[PDB]
Write an enzyme that holds these catalytic residues in place. Structure first.
Site, PDB file in Angstrom:
ATOM      1  N   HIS A  67       0.810  -1.226   0.000  1.00 44.22           N
ATOM      2  CA  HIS A  67       0.000   0.000   0.000  1.00 44.22           C
ATOM      3  C   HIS A  67       0.845   1.279   0.000  1.00 44.22           C
ATOM      4  CE1 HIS A  67      -1.983  -3.333   2.176  1.00 44.22           C
ATOM      5  NE2 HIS A  67      -3.008  -3.060   1.387  1.00 44.22           N
TER       6      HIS A  67
HETATM    7  S1  FES Z   1       1.907  -0.424   3.175  1.00 41.71           S
HETATM    8 FE1  FES Z   1       0.292  -1.832   3.668  1.00 41.71          FE
HETATM    9  S2  FES Z   1       1.365  -3.639   4.326  1.00 41.71           S
HETATM   10 FE2  FES Z   1       2.954  -2.154   4.021  1.00 41.71          FE
END
Ligand code: FES
Length: 141
Positions: free
Chosen positions: A106
């Site tokens: 993410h």
């Molecule tokens: S940014 Fe979501 S698991 Fe690392």
């Protein structure tokens, strides 16, 4: 006992060794002079998470670069390779926008001391119980 003992004698500057402990990766990076200087150039006020997240020291310690490494010289960065957002493995080798790690799940960016700087992760990568027991070996746990 749970503790394990990692031979770091052959780890050169700019190399990360990844070892599995308690079922998860631990990153042991021997930091470059650039990594160290950049980590030490960050002011606490710039950080998303000002807590050291470091099992070896007071739980209220500030996330200064010095409180993120095992040694005073700042060469030895040992942390759980577990993104504090949802647990993906952050990609190293000086990745992301802050000269450290990038979590592609993410888009979390960690700096050269493993501190969170951008993205959904709420916390700096945590540091396990870890210490040198001689010149060449780090005990984890
Ligand atoms: S940014 Fe979501 S698991 Fe690392």
């Amino acid at each position: 006992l749970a503790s394990i003992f990692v031979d770091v004698s052959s780890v050169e500057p700019g190399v990360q060794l990844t070892v599995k402990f308690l079922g998860k990766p631990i990153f042991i990076r021997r930091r470059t002079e650039a990594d160290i200087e950049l980590g030490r150039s960050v002011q606490l006020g710039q950080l998303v998470d000002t807590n050291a997240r470091n099992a070896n020291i007071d739980a209220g310690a500030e996330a200064t670069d010095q409180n993120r490494t095992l040694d005073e010289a700042g060469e030895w960065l040992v942390m759980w390779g577990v993104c504090t957002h949802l647990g993906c493995v952050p990609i190293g080798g000086v990745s992301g926008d802050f000269g450290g790690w990038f979590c592609p799940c993410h888009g979390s960016h960690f700096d050269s001391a493993g501190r969170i700087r951008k993205g959904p992760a709420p916390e700096n990568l945590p540091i396990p119980l870890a210490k040198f027991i001689d010149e060449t070996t780090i005990q984890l746990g």
